[PDB]
Amino acid sequence: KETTIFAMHLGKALDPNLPVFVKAEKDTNIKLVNVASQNQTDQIQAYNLMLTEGKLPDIVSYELSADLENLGIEGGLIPLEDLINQHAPNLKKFFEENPRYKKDAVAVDGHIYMIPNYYDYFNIKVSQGYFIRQDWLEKLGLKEPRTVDELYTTLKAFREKDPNGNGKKDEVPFFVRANNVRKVLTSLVDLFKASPIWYEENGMVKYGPAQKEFKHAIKELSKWYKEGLIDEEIFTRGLESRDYLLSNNLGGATDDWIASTSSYNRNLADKIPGFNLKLVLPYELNGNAKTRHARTTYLGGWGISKDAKDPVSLIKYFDYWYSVEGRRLWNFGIEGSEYTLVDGKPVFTDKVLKNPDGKTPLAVLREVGAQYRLGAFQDAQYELGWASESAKAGYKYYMDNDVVLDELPILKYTKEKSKEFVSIDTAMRAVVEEKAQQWILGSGDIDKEWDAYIKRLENLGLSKAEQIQNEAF
Ligand SMILES: [Ca+2]
Numbered sequence: 001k002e003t004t005i006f007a008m009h010l011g012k013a014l015d016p017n018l019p020v021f022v023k024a025e026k027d028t029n030i031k032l033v034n035v036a037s038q039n040q041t042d043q044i045q046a047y048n049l050m051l052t053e054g055k056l057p058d059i060v061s062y063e064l065s066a067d068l069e070n071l072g073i074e075g076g077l078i079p080l081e082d083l084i085n086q087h088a089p090n091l092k093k094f095f096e097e098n099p100r101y102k103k104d105a106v107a108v109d110g111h112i113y114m115i116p117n118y119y120d121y122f123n124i125k126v127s128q129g130y131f132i133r134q135d136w137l138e139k140l141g142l143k144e145p146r147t148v149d150e151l152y153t154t155l156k157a158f159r160e161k162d163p164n165g166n167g168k169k170d171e172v173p174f175f176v177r178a179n180n181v182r183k184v185l186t187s188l189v190d191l192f193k194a195s196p197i198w199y200e201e202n203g204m205v206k207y208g209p210a211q212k213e214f215k216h217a218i219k220e221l222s223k224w225y226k227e228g229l230i231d232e233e234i235f236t237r238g239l240e241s242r243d244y245l246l247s248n249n250l251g252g253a254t255d256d257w258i259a260s261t262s263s264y265n266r267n268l269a270d271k272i273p274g275f276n277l278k279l280v281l282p283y284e285l286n287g288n289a290k291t292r293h294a295r296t297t298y299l300g301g302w303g304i305s306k307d308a309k310d311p312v313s314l315i316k317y318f319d320y321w322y323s324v325e326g327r328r329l330w331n332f333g334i335e336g337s338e339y340t341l342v343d344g345k346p347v348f349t350d351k352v353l354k355n356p357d358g359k360t361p362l363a364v365l366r367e368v369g370a371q372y373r374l375g376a377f378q379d380a381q382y383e384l385g386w387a388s389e390s391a392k393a394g395y396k397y398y399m400d401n402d403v404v405l406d407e408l409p410i411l412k413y414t415k416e417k418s419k420e421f422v423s424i425d426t427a428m429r430a431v432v433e434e435k436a437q438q439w440i441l442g443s444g445d446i447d448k449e450w451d452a453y454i455k456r457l458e459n460l461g462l463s464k465a466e467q468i469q470n471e472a473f
Contacts, residue, residue: 001313004057005032006050007302008043009373010366014061018369019334024326030317032059051076056305058314061374063300065104065114070415072113077303079111083315090322091115091315094377098122100409104298108412108472115318115375116298123380125404126395128187128293131261132253134278136163148191148220148285151253155229158252173252174224175231177242181433184234186293187255188440192217193288196432198408198425198469205408205469209432210457218439219446226442235437246277255293258398262390279394282403291398294407302375321376331382333370339385348385361386411472421468424461431456 007014013036016025025031035057040046047062056076062068071077084091095102100121105112137144137154140161145151155173157163164171176187185196194217195208208214224230231237231251237244245251246264249272254261258279268275282291302318304311320326332339332346339346352361365371371378384392398404413421435453439446 001029001310002031002033003059003308003314003317004035005059005061005302006035006047006057007032007059007061007372007374008036008040008046009063009300011041011043013038013040013046014372014374015369018367018372019337020329020369020372023329023334024317024320027326028317028320030313055307058305058308059302059317060305061300061302063373065116065298065301065410066412066418068114068301068303069107069412072107072111072303073109073414076306077113078306078308078311079113080115080304080315080318081106081112083304083311084112084319087312088315088319088322090319094322100406101297103409105301106412108414114301114303116301117373117375118298118377119295120378120380120383121295121297124383124395124399125294125406126258126398127295128190128256129258129261129291129394129398130191130253130255130280130282131277132280133158133163133251134276135274136252139163139274144280146281146284148283151191151283152224152229155224155253156227159228163252164249169228170250171252172231172245172250173229175237175241175245175251175254176234177239177254177256178234179238181235181437182429185433185436188221188230188234189214189217190255190292191283191285192220193285193290195292196436199292200406200408200473203473205466205473207428207457207462207466209428209436210454210462215446215450218436221440222442222446225440230440235441247271249275258394259387259391262394263388265390279397281397281401290403290405292405292407294404296407297409300373300375318375321374327377327379330370330372330376331379332385333365333368338365338368338370346381346385353386409473411469413468413472417468417472421465424465427460428457428462428465431460 005014013034014032016032016034021032035050036046043063050057060068060077068077095105101118104116107113136158140157140163142154142157145154158171158173162169176184178184178187182196189196192213194211194213197208198205199208221230242254242256242261246268261277262279264277265275282289304314308314321330328346335341338352339348348361352364355364362371438444
């Protein structure tokens with residue numbers, strides 16, 4: 001059966017002749033025909049153009065789920081929940097076994113309009129983590145800090161005791177990597193168990209920047225900033241911060257993405273003798289040793305349009321990607337080309353792990369149509385199949401110690417509540433970022449100014465936004 005689809009990902013329209021989709025056609029007898037051409041590169045433009053047709057393609061795939069769900073509410077996509085319950089055993093069991101993932105699939109009106117492209121979140125939750133210069137701790141006779149007060153003592157010693165050995169007070173004890181204010185705050189306030197965004201607490205949704213922990217975080221950060229413990233240029237350096245500070249042997253500690261930050265030991269070993277930037281668990285504050293840095297559960301998804309003539313066959317195509325072999329196909333490519341089975345489990349080939357032109361394993365996989373964002377279920381075993389030893393070590397450490405808290409899910413709103421919420425959320429963001437940056441850099445006094453700042457947030461609509469967020473959760 002020839003089945004029309006709108007599908008794009010990373011600027012490329014899905015080519016059904018790629019090995020992954022030829023295999024799935026051989027297994028399912030569904031042959032996709034894309035309405036997006038090989039010349040289109042702008043998925044937002046091509047999607048909107050596609051929606052002006054009198055007939056929609058059989059399957060509609062898009063990166064932004066809220067747009068798919070609105071198209072469902074408008075009647076352009078059909079509800080899927082009865083189709084799944086009646087005809088898609090793999091999805092039916094997946095939703096039963098994963099109530100969190102089921103939430104991502106249910107739209108604001110209680111219908112399912114799209115199947116998300118899920119990360120394997122419960123197997124790898126891990127994004128950012130805390131790193132510290134083990135070789136500096138050791139040469140200074142310091143324990144690994146395990147609380148925020150112990151970190152303070154540690155960063156003070158980094159700043160005052162010349163661990164890079166050059167007789168200059170040039171050490172930058174704590175730094176971040178960011179290119180906007182929200183990203184700076186994200187990597188500073190999590191240490192103090194605060195949040196710059198919305199979060200979940202005791203089943204309710206709350207606004208990070210209005211909390212007592214945020215006040216305490218900014219006050220402490222302002223104190224550490226004044227004492228030279230936090231990079232004087234936190235808000236002015238950009239994405240070059242980590243490379244500049246680590247490669248010049250100035251930086252002592254950070255909070256940053258685990259896979260990339262764990263690469264510096266191997267890169268700087270010949271250049272900085274003894275260099276060991278080491279991943280540690282989140283520091284404890286008042287009994288809390290969690291981090292709110294977490295991966296997300298999905299990105300994008302796909303649905304069936306009102307114009308598909310055989311939706312039952314299409315829900316089975318959707319279900320194929322949740323079978324054992326369909327999920328392995330999507331994640332790993334073709335057996336005998338991208339991977340072999342070793343004791344029942346895929347092991348990538350040299351074609352994937354040692355591409356002679358320098359291509360990454362994921363880039364090689366993408367070229368066969370693996371990992372092509374639709375409504376499939378990523379497998380963390382695909383990622384561990386190629387990730388570096390230090391990346392995998394960091395993932396395992398944070399996973400085994402259960403330190404990562406689930407992020408607030410992507411919430412669902414009607415179009416009108418969304419506009420209302422976004423207008424409020426945008427206005428408050430501007431206030432929080434202005435005030436927190438100035439407080440951290442030592443302007444004014446947060447104790448004297450906190451109340452008026454909270455009233456400004458309330459005047460911008462904080463209570464209404466809380467009401468909308470809690471309804472949506
Ligand atoms: Ca020094």
